[PDB]
Design a binder for this molecule. Structure first.
Ligand SMILES: O=c1ccn([C@@H]2O[C@H](COP(=O)(O)O)[C@@H](O)[C@H]2O)c(=O)[nH]1
Length: 125
């Protein structure tokens, strides 16, 4: 199981965060009640060439509230690597009817944000 969407990549040194009311990827199969979730940070490192580990740019993946690797965390719960996003008017209920993605059945939806959304500096898709 995986995120329904492709990642955001962090080039700066701050964690992801969105203005209140923006941040949820567009998904034409979801309703206005579903527009709420969290982004989870994913780290990666490689043997850097000098024999030492090299940290790569963190990526951040979105999961609907109540799904994914932190399916049990309630909205706004404070956990390192977890940041919360919601469209105004989204219901605060688990989205188990959307679930997570099986890569052996569906590729990721290309991540895109609703118009007028400001990504923090150093974050790109
Ligand atoms: O936190 C993560 C890491 C990978 N993925 C995606 O899951 C898929 C499989 O990743 P994996 O081979 O590293 O398990 C691939 O499409 C990744 O981009 C997530 O959805 N969330």
């Amino acid at each position: 199981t995986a995120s329904w969407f492709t990642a955001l990549t962090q080039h700066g040194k701050e964690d992801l965060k969105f203005p209140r009311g923006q941040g949820v990827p567009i998904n034409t199969n979801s309703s206005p009640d579903d527009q709420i979730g969290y982004y989870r940070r994913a780290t990666r490192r490689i043997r850097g060439g000098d024999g030492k580990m090299k940290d790569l740019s963190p990526r951040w993946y979105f999961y609907y509230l109540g799904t994914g690797p932190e399916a049990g965390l309630p909205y706004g719960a404070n956990k390192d690597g977890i940041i919360w996003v919601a469209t105004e008017g989204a219901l605060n209920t688990p989205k188990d009817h959307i679930g997570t993605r099986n890569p052996a059945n569906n590729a990721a939806i290309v991540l895109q944000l609703p118009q007028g959304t400001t990504l923090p500096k150093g974050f790109y898709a």
